[PDB]
Structure 1
Amino acid sequence: HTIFSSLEVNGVNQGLGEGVRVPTYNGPIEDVTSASIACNGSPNTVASTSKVITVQAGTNVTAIWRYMLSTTGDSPADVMDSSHKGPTIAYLKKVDNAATASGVGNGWFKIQQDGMDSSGVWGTERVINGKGRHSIKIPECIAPGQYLLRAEMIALHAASNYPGAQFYMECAQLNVVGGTGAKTPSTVSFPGAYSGSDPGVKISIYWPPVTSYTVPGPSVFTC
């Protein structure tokens, strides 16, 4: 239970729900076939925001994860419960109007992931124990203009069967400046990119303990 409730750009937090479409409640999506898997949604409610955040291509933005919208600290419990082990992931989608585009459908490409490292530590544990900071590089080589940024944490502690995996995601609204357009990503759809049968979705993280993890979705796009 967690929310990507603000984005840091150029080292400055852009504000709570400012340029990030935040849900009222911190619960997960569990149905990977739902329209809500793209940018969150029903049975939650997600707020619209008029802010589109300018970001220089090639630089990092940092999603700031918090337990609830009103949370005021950054200790582990202020981010997400330590039972919630799994990957962190981020995607972009080119859109016409980042303040209104829904994010459902084709156009997503993966730009970051952190599953399980060679020491058995999960991406979510780096966020939980890193003050909620989920750093994401905006590629330098993509086309400039308006995008959605979907940042996600998947908790797998209850994922031995499907449904069970818990998907926490929010979409931020970006204007990417300086992108060279030198490379056009291949894209996937949300819903569509994840299946309840995926090895990273239906998984028993303790039975036996896993030492390798396959993050769901496509490969990370690189310039």
Structure 2
Amino acid sequence: HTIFSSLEVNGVNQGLGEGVRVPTYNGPIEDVTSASIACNGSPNTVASTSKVITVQAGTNVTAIWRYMLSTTGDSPADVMDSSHKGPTIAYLKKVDNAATASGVGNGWFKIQQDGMDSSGVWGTERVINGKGRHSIKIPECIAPGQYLLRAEMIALHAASNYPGAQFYMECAQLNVVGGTGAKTPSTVSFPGAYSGSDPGVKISIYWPPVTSYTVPGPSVFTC
């Protein structure tokens, strides 16, 4: 249970729920076929925001994960329970208007992921123990303009069967400045990119102890 509730850019937090479309409830999406898998949604409720956050292409945005919208600390329990082991992931979608695009459908491309490392530590654990900070590089070579950023943590502690994996995501609204447009990513759809049978979605992280992990979705886009 967690929310990507604000975004930091060039050292500046853009504000709670400002430019990030936040639910007030921190529960996961469970059905990868639901429209809610794109930018969260029913049975949650997601607020709108008229802020579109500017970021220079090639630089990083940092999603700031918190337990609840009311959480004001940054200790592990203020981020997400440490049972919730799994990957962190981030995607972009080029859109006409970052405040009105729903995010549902084709156009997403993956720009970051962190599954399990060679020490057995998961991407969510680095966020939990790193003040909720999930740092994500905006590629230099993409087209400038309006985008959605979908940042995600997947908790796998109850994922032995499907349903079971817990998908926590929110969409931020970006104005990417300075992208060269030299490369146009191949894209996937949400819903569509994940399936309940994926090896990183239906997975026992206990039996046997997990030593490698396949993050769901497409390969990371690179310039």
TM-score interval, smaller chain: over 0.9
- Partners of 2:91 and 2:72 lie apart in 1 by 27
- Partners of 1:210 and 1:198 lie apart in 2 by 15
Report deviation, 1:75: 0.2
Report deviation, 1:134: 0.1
- Partners of 1:141 and 1:174 lie apart in 2 by 16
- Partners of 2:125 and 2:97 lie apart in 1 by 34
Report deviation, 1:59: 0.3
- Partners of 1:121 and 1:142 lie apart in 2 by 31
- Partners of 1:190 and 1:103 lie apart in 2 by 8
Report deviation, 1:132: 0.1
Deviations 1:8-57 (A, max 9, x none): 01110000000000001000000000000000000000000000001000
SS at match of 2:194: coil
CA RMSD of aligned residues (A): 0.3
SS at match of 2:47: coil
SS at match of 2:181: coil
Report deviation, 1:210: 0.7
- Partners of 2:13 and 2:72 lie apart in 1 by 14
Report deviation, 1:217: 0.1
- Partners of 2:4 and 2:187 lie apart in 1 by 23
Deviations 1:153-202 (A, max 9, x none): 00000000000000000000000000000000000000000000000000
- Partners of 1:54 and 1:158 lie apart in 2 by 37
Which runs of no fewer than 5 residues in structure 2 stay unpaired?
none
Large movers: runs of 4+ above 2 Å: none
State how 1:15-94 maps to structure 2 within 5 Å.
15-94=15-94
Report deviation, 1:112: 0.1
SS at match of 2:150: strand
Q: Is 1:136 aligned to residue 147 of structure 2?
A: no
Deviations 1:131-166 (A, max 9, x none): 000000000000000000000000000000000000
- Partners of 1:104 and 1:90 lie apart in 2 by 15
Could you tell me which residue of structure 1 aligns to residue 155 of structure 2? 155
SS at match of 1:161: coil
- Partners of 2:66 and 2:154 lie apart in 1 by 14
Q: How many residues align?
A: 223
SS at match of 1:134: strand
